[PDB]
């Protein structure tokens with residue numbers, strides 16, 4: 001028993017982190033096979049960030065201007081190309097620690113682990129979720145760009161995020177491993193504001209199932225509701241609308257606990273309408289929305 | 305900016321996890337040099353757990369009864385000995401992935417990362433704290449015993465915890481790497497209850513400094529207090545008494561923010577007396593006590 005914000009083991013990803021320097025800027029890169037992936041803003045000076053023309057900036061760069069270091073050994077760059085907002089630095093050596101991998105673009109509401117890095121060295125690992133407004137609430141300082149987000153399926157690392165920037169609001173923006181930003185964000189130091197940060201309803205419900213499985217049942221009530229009635233309440237509290245697909249995905253948690261999805265929805269409805277009254281659920285005083293139904297099942301079953 | 309419950313990268317520890325089987329029981333072991341460390345309750349049947357005599361149980365065991373597997377390869381056991389509540393299985397091969405390590409016994413209030421494992425395979429990593437009642441609020445299922453707690457100092461892994469059991473209350477008990485339990489717990493399936501779980505005051509204050517550093521300042525007030533006045537309030541809310549050593553340790557956070565430790569104590573006092581009024585601090589609706597002053601400085605400075 002017990003329920004923690006758990007990240008995937010980071011070893012397979014640690015073996016891919018490298019340092020990429022271009023001019024005076026040093027950030028992180030991801031070394032997979034004979035390619036190093038990094039944010040293209042590595043080629044910018046802090047002055048350039050206000051309005052950079054990356055194609056023009058890239059013309060002044062050659063293979064030898066990109067310094068790639070894995071541990072204390074320098075990698076030889078034999079090619080460079082821009083794919084959307086990432087640079088792909090072709091190196092002459094394939095990473096001997098390359099795990100089985102995939103590049104996946106995630107949907108809002110999905111979760112992933114972040115291995116925060118500075119100067120190509122891992123400093124920590126934590127669990128995140130892609131917010132419905134396509135930001136992530138990470139923990140990143142200067143030098144963290146190029147840190148990646150990932151999921152692990154047994155021995156296969158699915159890379160889903162690469163860190164690019166912090167918005168003036170302190171939230172984080174980035175791309176998938178093909179260089180496309182999540183959301184409307186651009187790699188420019190400009191007025192960019194995130195939209196409404198709505199609560200991931202399907203994740204909150206999954207976390208209520210985890211609480212029931214772990215013994216916290218005070219919030220269970222004698223009521224039920226309908227998808228339409230529940231969503232009237234969800235909209236008022238800036239919660240994502242619950243769909244029949246979400247009910248279906250919550251199916252195995254409903255089967256495990258014997259509590260119907262709509263019954264759990266009515267408990268959530270009352271928690272939204274009346275608050276927690278000074279009580280806690282899984283050691284938290286608010287409704288947690290950064291555990292998907294898959295994370296709850298995985299944590300409550302022991303998937304290694 | 306941003307503040308997350310961050311665990312250390314787990315790679316160095318993943319390379320030490322092995323599976324140890326004795327009879328029908330399989331748990332995790334820690335392979336360092338030519339020794340595999342595991343809970344001694346590996347030699348027990350579920351019947352034995354009610355009142356095991358480990359010396360008598362160990363007499364019936366030989367080197368060949370302890371099956372040690374690292375990945376898909378079997379390790380040859382050439383020795384076995386009991387040190388307090390851990391077994392030390394001498395293997396004929398030194399772990400080639402052994403990192404620089406130390407065995408340290410931690411104080412209550414200190415934090416560490418846990419790499420939860422099942423069948424010698426890592427499933428997840430999370431951050432924990434040794435509670436003042438010597439329990440940890442982990443996330444562990446059947447098969448997780450032998451999972452370890454650790455801290456990392458650059459390239460040196462300081463092992464501090466080995467998981468042994470879950471108390472009837474759902475909290476977790478375990479030992480240091482020399483086999484001595486944290487707290488009064490014994491490796492017996494018996495009526496064992498944890499004492500009062502007090503709040504680690506020095507950690508809450510450090511997390512209030514992290515909140516100020518990250519922009520959350522609503523709780524800052526026009527008041528100050530004294531160590532004695534603060535502790536009168538701390539005792540009433542089952543908070544650990546704040547000492548001059550704690551004030552000293554909070555020194556660099558006080559210097560960084562310009563907020564005196566006693567001023568932060570008065571803000572905490574008002575938060576205890578009046579609650580958060582529906583507001584949040586670092587995305588939390590309660591006072592977080594599982595970040596030491598060192599964790600806050602590390603996370604807010606970028607220690608890799």
Ligand SMILES: COc1ccccc1OCCNC(=O)c1cc(=O)[nH]c2cccc(OC)c12
Pocket residue numbers: 041049140141142143144145164165166172186187188189190305
């Ligand atoms: C506005 O900056 C950019 C705009 C578009 C594209 C890139 C931009 O930044 C590049 C450098 N960013 C970081 O290293 C940075 C990332 C982060 O998540 N947190 C920080 C916290 C404090 C200071 C920081 O940088 C000085 C960071």
Ligand SMILES: COc1ccccc1OCCNC(=O)c1cc(=O)[nH]c2cccc(OC)c12
Pocket residue numbers: 001345353444445446447448449468469470476490491492493494
């Ligand atoms: C009362 O048991 C013991 C007493 C003393 C010493 C050892 C005891 O347990 C040995 C086996 N323990 C685990 O594998 C176990 C550990 C854990 O933290 N959570 C669980 C959650 C559900 C089921 C579980 O085991 C069947 C566990």
